[PDB]
């Protein structure tokens, strides 16, 4: 389902992602834009036999379980398939855990590349929230 910036921004604010840890909404909506382009259903394979799932592209080696990745730690303790739903809660709950490992949002390739050090509050400019 392709979310749309301020619709996603509202849903994420509601789910406590505004200043979660100390990252304002714009970071999360930014990551969601460059990781998945707001499409909940997005999957992508990586070079080790693991796939990235959903809107926040949480990977199956470390974070969720998809029944076929070698080395599955499944830290978020959720089936990866649950991350593909049109309501972002299993993805937001797993995202809260990823941030809590003492590495911040660096865990997200596209937040790093396209959102670290940018004016991330542009991502909610003109959004009702």
């Amino acid at each position: 389902k392709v979310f749309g910036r301020c619709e996603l921004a509202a849903a994420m604010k509601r789910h406590g992602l505004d200043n979660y840890r100390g990252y304002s909404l714009g970071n999360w909506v930014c990551a969601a834009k460059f990781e998945s382009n707001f499409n909940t259903q997005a999957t992508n394979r990586n070079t080790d036999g693991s796939t990235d799932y959903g809107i926040l592209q949480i990977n199956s080696r470390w974070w969720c379980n998809d029944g076929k990745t070698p080395g599955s730690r499944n830290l978020c303790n959720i089936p990866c398939s649950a991350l593909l739903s049109s309501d972002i809660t299993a993805s937001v709950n797993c995202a809260k855990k990823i941030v809590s490992d003492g590495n911040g949002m660096n865990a997200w390739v596209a937040w790093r590349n396209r959102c670290k050090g940018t004016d991330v509050q542009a991502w909610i400019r003109g959004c009702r929230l």
Partner: antibody
Amino acid sequence: VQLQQSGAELMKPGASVKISCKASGYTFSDYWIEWVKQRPGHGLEWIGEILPGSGSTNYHERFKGKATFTADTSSSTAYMQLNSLTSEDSGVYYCLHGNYDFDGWGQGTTLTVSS
Amino acid sequence: DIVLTQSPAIMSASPGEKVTMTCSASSSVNYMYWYQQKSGTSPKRWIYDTSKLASGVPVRFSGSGSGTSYSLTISSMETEDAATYYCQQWGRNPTFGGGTKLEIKR
């Protein structure tokens, strides 16, 4: 149950064909089904795959645009549509499973593209 | 992504003989998968996650390797191991090797 596929097809160049994979026997929604092409003489090519429950689809560079996968949740069927069929599309197409609970393959649908 | 090459193309072997076929990858792969095909039927996943034997593979098969060079080894060759064994890197976008046909010598 099984992974039962469609029978062989004969198609002209330019047309599009759709192949069924009736994957019955488990929670369909939950497991990726992969599709592979065997050109007798070249061997195997990996086309892509679909996770029927969400409809998340992953393709190999070479087939993004030649292939489209869909799944009908109510008949436990996955479909692979191959479009703009050319002579090089003739081959045996397999649907399969590659996970730790089961790794079954189907027998293949042979496709011949000729006039 | 990676190009995989299987040495050699066809091999002869008697029963009781030890067989090792090799699959090399043009760039490092994290794991390898071997499938067998008997002419007449679909491929069957034989070895997965480099060394794990799929359901029904006799224990006499083993897979090994790392980075670039991987292999499948049959200790006592038996007649029903005559097939083509293909290897595959199942990374960002999978590729299979050209196979190694195993036919028995008589």
